[PDB]
Amino acid sequence: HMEGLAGYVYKAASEGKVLTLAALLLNRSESDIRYLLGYVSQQGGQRSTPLIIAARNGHAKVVRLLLEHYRVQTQQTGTVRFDGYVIDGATALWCAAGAGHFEVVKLLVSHGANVNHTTVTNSTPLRAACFDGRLDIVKYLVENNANISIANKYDNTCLMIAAYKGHTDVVRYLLEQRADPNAKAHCGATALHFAAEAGHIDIVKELIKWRAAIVVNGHGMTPLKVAAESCKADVVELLLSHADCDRRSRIEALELLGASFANDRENYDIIKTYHYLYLAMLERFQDGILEKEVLPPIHAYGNRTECRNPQELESIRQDRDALHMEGLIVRERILG
Numbered sequence: 402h403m404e405g406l407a408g409y410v411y412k413a414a415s416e417g418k419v420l421t422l423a424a425l426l427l428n429r430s431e432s433d434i435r436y437l438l439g440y441v442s443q444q445g446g447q448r449s450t451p452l453i454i455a456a457r458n459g460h461a462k463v464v465r466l467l468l469e470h471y472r473v474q475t476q477q478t479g480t481v482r483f484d485g486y487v488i489d490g491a492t493a494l495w496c497a498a499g500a501g502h503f504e505v506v507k508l509l510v511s512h513g514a515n516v517n518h519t520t521v522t523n524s525t526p527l528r529a530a531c532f533d534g535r536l537d538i539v540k541y542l543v544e545n546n547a548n549i550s551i552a553n554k555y556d557n558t559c560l561m562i563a564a565y566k567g568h569t570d571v572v573r574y575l576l577e578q579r580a581d582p583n584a585k586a587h588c589g590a591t592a593l594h595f596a597a598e599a600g601h602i603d604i605v606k607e608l609i610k611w612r613a614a615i616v617v618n619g620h621g622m623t624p625l626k627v628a629a630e631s632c633k634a635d636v637v638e639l640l641l642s643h644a645d646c647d648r649r650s651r652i653e654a655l656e657l658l659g660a661s662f663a664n665d666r667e668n669y670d671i672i673k674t675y676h677y678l679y680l681a682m683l684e685r686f687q688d689g690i691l692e693k694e695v696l697p698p699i700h701a702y703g704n705r706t707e708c709r710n711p712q713e714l715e716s717i718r719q720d721r722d723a724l725h726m727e728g729l730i731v732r733e734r735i736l737g
């Protein structure tokens with residue numbers, strides 16, 4: 402019964418106990434040793450191999466011994482648990498990149514591991530490191546020909562996932578490494594959209610610095626409207642100090658931004674509501690004008706109607722409750 406004996410090998414590899422592992426695979430023939438080291442074991446909800454689990458747990462010593470003396474392939478595929486989620490198609494490399502085991506990653510590429518291996522979802526180990534934000538790994542993977550153009554199943558680039566996760570220092574690195582800033586996911590989204598909605602004011606600036614294009618995401622919105630809808634005012638001012646539409650895109654962002662100050666405790670502030678929405682109306686009433694196409698009074702948000710004139714809006718810096726309903730009403734004109 403060699404079944405459970407390969408488990409003791411799996412435990413010792415995961416446990417990092419190199420001597421316990423070293424001693425298990427000694428007076429064993431090559432028939433045996435190849436089986437025990439390539440055995441796929443189920444740890445509750447995790448199927449891996451002694452190499453994979455040891456690299457997944459940052460056990461450098463154990464990862465060294467398997468590659469040098471015992472010459473175990475790095476092609477080996479497994480399914481590991483991370484973040485609570487389950488990933489399939491992971492090499493010992495990929496687990497080590499996502500976990501941020503710097504020395505272990507170097508160990509595997511040093512001993513010939515595919516740096517552009519694709520998980521089932523087509524996530525390069527480089528993508529993993531760009532989620533975790535280990536610049537050391539990212540600089541190292543790129544320096545070993547890991548291709549930054551490889552994207553996940555949904556055309557989500559390492560640049561995007563980084564601009565999402567706030568990893569400013571790596572977004573600068575990928576851009577310096579000539580990562581295409583105008584990538585588009587199936588969502589029709591760009592690294593800008595991800596950063597705009599997320600409020601990563603620094604990353605937005607870098608994308609700006611790298612002549613990133615203003616795309617309207619595949620489902621209706623520019624990164625200006627996305628940041629306004631996500632109520633990230635910092636990003637909206639920075640983005641508005643560049644181009645847009647004449648007054649359409651610009652008054653939309655302001656109206657929308659003030660309107661998002663009516664929804665959820667993201668900064669649920671009506672003082673910043675009146676501020677941005679009154680600004681927006683001013684930019685409409687200069688000469689003559691930018692007409693307001695106001696939706697009909699409906700049973701839901703009270704039978705109110707959007708303010709058309711600045712005079713109608715000037716009458717509500719007081720009366721808090723009416724301002725709240727205005728946010729809902731306008732958010733319905735610009736979105737629906």
Ligand SMILES: CC(C)(C)N1C(=O)c2ccc(C(=O)O)cc2C1=O
Nearest residue numbers: 483484499500524528529532553562
């Ligand atoms: C969704 C994508 C594909 C970007 N993806 C990983 O491949 C991945 C690997 C490791 C972690 C972690 O946080 O440890 C998170 C992710 C993660 O979001």
